[PDB]
């Protein structure tokens, strides 16, 4: 029921710094959030480094 959006036309190559000025603060996570992420990710990488046949990068 809302309007069909106008043909897409965002600015092609805006300034990186101004984007970073938004993304950097918003990326913040609490210590417990980061702790879960760190643990999950370590477990994923441990599995990855278990070593199965391999991939192209391995070759």
């Amino acid at each position: 029921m809302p309007n069909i959006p106008p043909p897409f036309t965002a600015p092609y190559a805006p300034d990186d710094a101004e984007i970073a000025a938004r993304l950097l603060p918003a990326s913040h996570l609490s210590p417990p959030q980061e702790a879960r992420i760190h643990r999950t990710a370590t477990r994923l990488i441990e599995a990855i480094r278990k070593r199965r046949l391999g991939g192209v990068e391995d070759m």
Partner: protein
Amino acid sequence: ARVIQPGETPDGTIGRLVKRLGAPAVRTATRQAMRLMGNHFVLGETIEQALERGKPRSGQ
């Protein structure tokens, strides 16, 4: 038989290895070390044990 509590700070040569490679790779590396030690060394607690282990089939 000990009991290993979780969350132990990885220290020592092995702990540092675990932090860097991950525990699974260390196990894999250890298994490889096992084939090297078993295949390329003739070892025992005493010389007699080493020598018995290193012997050939028979009349050989």
